[PDB]
Amino acid sequence: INRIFHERFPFELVKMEFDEKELRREISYAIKNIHGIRTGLFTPDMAFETIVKKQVKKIREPCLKCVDMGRTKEQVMLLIDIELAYMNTNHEDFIGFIRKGWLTINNIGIMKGGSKEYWFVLTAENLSWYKDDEEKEKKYMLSVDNLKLRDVEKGFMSSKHIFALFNTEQRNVYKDYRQLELACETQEEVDSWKASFLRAGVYPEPQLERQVETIRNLVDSYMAIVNKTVRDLMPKTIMH
């Protein structure tokens, strides 16, 4: 049973919730107030320390519950007070810081081999084509952003219904050979694809924020260490 604790206890340490909006408000005001009258060149350190101390002070609750599940409690409190006395930034911290289907190729070059069906996956973020349906080859990748839909130039006979994907806002050609014409058996599939591409985001035919996020990245990294330590001392302090 006393080893149910020491495995329930980590659960009590992860019941803590943080209001990120209030957190970013406090970080911003901390940076501005620390510089005082100056505009500052580098991110202040006291902004990091002030936030971390506020979060560490909450660990007292689960630790006292674990004990209940005089001298023992006094030791636990002391082991938490000493966590607020010094910020050891050398302890392994960050030092120095939608639609799928088979589609054929209409414009065939030497690199295409022939007019064959390829497995195509469309997501909100990117586009991918594969020789098979295992989605492992990753032969061709194309981004949804900076992409535009195009129609086949007048004169093409609709033996197969085709839509074209052409990247227009990138210097990366993304292997857009002959405008990357993809054919379907019926027009309904082509229109469904075009709608899917546009829904994905395809074109239809202060520096203070970086500092705030950098502080947040550091605070989370440090508290990962602090939680690891308290998870280790509590099973030992109570035994001793």
UniProtKB/Swiss-Prot annotation:
Residues 98-202 form the PH domain. Changing M46R: Significantly decreases receptor-mediated endocytosis. Phosphorylated by CDK5 leading to synaptic vesicle endocytosis (SVE) activation. It is found in: Cell membrane; Membrane, Clathrin-coated pit; Cytoplasmic vesicle; Presynapse. Homodimer; homodimerization is mediated by the dynamin-type G domain which promotes assembly-stimulated GTPase activity. Homo-tetramer formed from two dimers in the absence of lipid. Oligomerizes into a helical polymer that self-assembles around the vesicle membrane, when associated to the menbrane through lipid binding. The dynamin-type G mediates homodimerization and plays a role in self-assembly. The C-terminal proline-rich domain (PRD) mediates interaction with SH3-binding partners. Is required for DNM1 self-assembly. Belongs to the TRAFAC class dynamin-like GTPase superfamily. Dynamin/Fzo/YdjA family. It is linked to Developmental and epileptic encephalopathy 31A: An autosomal dominant epileptic encephalopathy, a heterogeneous group of severe early-onset epilepsies characterized by refractory seizures, neurodevelopmental impairment, and poor prognosis. Development is normal prior to seizure onset, after which cognitive and motor delays become apparent. Developmental and epileptic encephalopathy 31B: A form of epileptic encephalopathy, a heterogeneous group of severe early-onset epilepsies characterized by refractory seizures, neurodevelopmental impairment, and poor prognosis. Development is normal prior to seizure onset, after which cognitive and motor delays become apparent. DEE31B is an autosomal recessive form with onset in the first months of life. Catalyzes the hydrolysis of GTP and utilizes this energy to mediate vesicle scission and participates in many forms of endocytosis, such as clathrin-mediated endocytosis or synaptic vesicle endocytosis as well as rapid endocytosis (RE). Associates to the membrane, through lipid binding, and self-assembles into rings and stacks of interconnected rings through oligomerization to form a helical polymer around the vesicle membrane leading to constriction of invaginated coated pits around their necks. This is Dynamin-1. The lineage of its organism: Eukaryota, Metazoa, Chordata, Craniata, Vertebrata. The chain holds residues 362 to 687 of 864 of the full protein.
